[PDB]
């Protein structure tokens, strides 16, 4: 559409999708890519997304998330106005796929296993993914998944966690966990974990469980699934106005999931209930979802690696991001 000037060595470029996505052969490996045109230096919030992402994924190594191969940008600060990501090609995404494929419990026990081994890697790195669903999860012909996109991740911090009532947030809201609406900014590990288990429950029907329409409708499907929250649960929420918008909801009951899913395998369903949890201390870990019964064909903590190291102007980011990606430039690679 527009230029992409990706080198000789990228060639044969068919559009896929802070810019634009594009497919590539690449004429020294011989395989063909992935390519994503970055074009954010004019403003700080999309240079901060865009140094937070490349410095993660550059640390990253792990089967089930994108590595970058490659990155190809201009040899001076000056010139360099975009920043193209280069990866393995992955034909698919989840979303896609949901929109016309009925999945089979192998399948999504499989992809499952590779969400939550990928997250396991993630979560060990202290980082957060904070915005998981299905568009974001890429799968190629042989049903490998790997997680991507990761513009709004952040480093944990368990203790910066709270806030107040009806606090603005930037992830998907259908995939956002209940305390985010209520306490909650999201600096938690427990956020991935709602969103996964968001994910699994629209793999076992091709639908999204909790589609609200807007910011607080969203917070009314999730009760009205899980009905309403315990007395236990309630005590957990400090904030007065959070408290007590719950406490004034008439009474909702549990939908039981065999009735939502009555498809589904029990384990299943088992594993959807701890994921899916209201009060997110109680809400199941990534090393407790893979350790559950559904995915024992799969679970090999041994095989599940971990990460070696744990996680401004724009002028300034600018600055990082091409000090960022000079490992990639043609000096060293001549
Ligand atoms: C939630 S969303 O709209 C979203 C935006 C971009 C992407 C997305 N970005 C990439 C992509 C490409 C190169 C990179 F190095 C990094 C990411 C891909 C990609 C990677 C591998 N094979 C095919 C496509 N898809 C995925 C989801």
């Known amino acids: 559409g527009q230029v ?10 068919s559009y896929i999708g802070y810019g634009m996505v594009c497919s590539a052969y690449d004429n020294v490996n011989k395989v063909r890519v992935a390519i994503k045109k970055i074009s954010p230096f004019e403003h700080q919030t999309y240079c ?3 140094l937070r992402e490349i410095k993660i994924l550059l640390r990253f190594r792990h089967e089930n998330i994108i590595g970058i191969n490659d990155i190809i940008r201009a040899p001076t600060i000056e010139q360099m106005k975009d920043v193209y990501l280069v990866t393995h090609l992955m034909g698919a995404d989840l979303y896609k796929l949901l929109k016309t494929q009925h999945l089979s419990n192998d399948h999504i026990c499989y992809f499952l ?3 939550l081994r990928g997250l396991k890697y993630i979560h060990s790195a202290n980082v957060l993914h904070r915005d998981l669903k299905p568009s974001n999860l890429l799968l190629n012909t042989t049903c490998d998944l790997k997680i991507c996109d990761f ?14 009532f009806l606090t603005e947030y930037v992830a998907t809201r259908w995939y956002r966990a209940p305390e985010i609406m209520l306490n909650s900014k999201g600096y938690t590990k427990s956020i991935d974990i709602w969103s ?23 917070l009314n499907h999730i009760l009205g699934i899980l009905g309403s929250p315990s007395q236990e649960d309630l005590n957990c929420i400090i904030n007065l106005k959070a408290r007590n918008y719950l406490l004034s909801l008439p009474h909702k009951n549990k939908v039981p999931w065999n009735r939502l899913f009555p498809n589904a395998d029990s384990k299943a369903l088992d594993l959807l209930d701890k994921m899916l949890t209201f009060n997110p201390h109680k809400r199941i870990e990534v090393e407790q979802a893979l350790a559950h019964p559904y995915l024992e064909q799969y679970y090999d903590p ?15 980011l600018k600055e990082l991001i091409f000090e960022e990606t000079a490992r990639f430039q043609p000096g060293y690679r001549s």
Do not use: W
């Open 4 to 13: 992409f000037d990706v080198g000789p060595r990228y060639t044969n470029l």
């Open 302 to 316: 041994s095989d599940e690696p971990i990460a070696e190291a744990p996680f401004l102007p724009k002028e300034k």
């Open 196 to 218: 996964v288990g968001c994910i699994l429950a629209e793999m076992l029907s091709n639908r999204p469980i909790f589609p609200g329409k807007h910011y607080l409708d969203q």
């Open 48 to 50: 901060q997304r865009t």
């Open 151 to 164: 513009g709004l991740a952040r480093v944990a911090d368990p203790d910066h966690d709270h806030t107040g």
């Open 113 to 115: 296993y590779q969400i």
